[PDB]
């Protein structure tokens, strides 16, 4: 493909973290450009899987989804090269910020950006399956982008059944996923509600102190997290709409983005 790069076009500079693989800060030499590089650890994740992740990322083009720049797929070790985001993941960012700078209007701006990305995936027949603040990245001037290594192809809106034995992040996971391993764009909507709660609390852990093995049983009986201190009523109403028991009663991402755009532009 046009995406293929020579391995010697990039040089590694720093390690950022690991694992199923490692992520490096590197340099694209001809352009003197700082980039991010994801590598495949041998032998953790299967190879065809990794390569398919790259294939899918080739079709993605949106200001709030992390942009692919090139791949190395001819020989091991394999690389996926993307744009570099200066300020790391959104969870640590919220936990460590100056709240006088990162104020209410900024929180609205962040939600608007993320929902724009999800509206795009909704139109293009993709699902994410691990939406959470830990998987969003931050740049200068409160720019936010969603990481997209785990996208799956799925017509809007059919259902994907996860593999037997899979383990989920329980406090972000929709009830139909917890009980029957079923995922759709509506389970992405549920998880988005939890992400909004993360943003409103500047990165607190959800359902504090509540034993994981009882979460499902509470959701069945209509327990939901309470309205956070300082959270606007309309935003909380949006949260609660995202957490309706029946998937078809939950709003679409186009509606959610419309609502946040209006709130942002009115503030």
Curated annotation (Swiss-Prot):
Annotated motif Kinase activation loop, positions: 148-172
Modified residues (Phosphoserine): 213
Modified residue annotations for Phosphotyrosine: 20, 24, 160, 180
Domain of life the protein comes from: Eukaryota
Active site: 130 (proton acceptor)
Chain sites annotated for binding ATP: 16-23, 38, 83-89
Domain Protein kinase, first and last residues per copy: 10-260
Tissue: Widely expressed.
PTM comment, free text: DNA damage-induced activation of ABL1 requires the function of ATM and Ser-213 phosphorylation. Polyubiquitinated. Polyubiquitination of ABL1 leads to degradation.
Location of the protein in the cell: Cytoplasm, Cytoskeleton; Nucleus; Mitochondrion
Disease linked to the protein: Leukemia, chronic myeloid: A clonal myeloproliferative disorder of a pluripotent stem cell with a specific cytogenetic abnormality, the Philadelphia chromosome (Ph), involving myeloid, erythroid, megakaryocytic, B-lymphoid, and sometimes T-lymphoid cells, but not marrow fibroblasts.
Assembly with partners or alone: Interacts with SORBS1 following insulin stimulation. Found in a trimolecular complex containing CDK5 and CABLES1. Interacts with CABLES1 and PSTPIP1. Interacts with ZDHHC16, ITGB1 and HCK. Interacts with STX17; probably phosphorylates STX17. Interacts with INPPL1/SHIP2. Interacts with ABI1, ABI2, BCR, CRK, FGR, FYN, HCK, LYN, PSMA7 RAD9A, RAD51, RAD52, TP73 and WASF3.
Similarity comment: Belongs to the protein kinase superfamily. Tyr protein kinase family. ABL subfamily.
Function: Non-receptor tyrosine-protein kinase that plays a role in many key processes linked to cell growth and survival such as cytoskeleton remodeling in response to extracellular stimuli, cell motility and adhesion, receptor endocytosis, autophagy, DNA damage response and apoptosis. Coordinates actin remodeling through tyrosine phosphorylation of proteins controlling cytoskeleton dynamics like WASF3 (involved in branch formation); ANXA1 (involved in membrane anchoring); DBN1, DBNL, CTTN, RAPH1 and ENAH (involved in signaling); or MAPT and PXN (microtubule-binding proteins).
Protein name, UniProt field: Tyrosine-protein kinase ABL1
Organism of derivation: Homo sapiens
Organism lineage: Eukaryota, Metazoa, Chordata, Craniata, Vertebrata
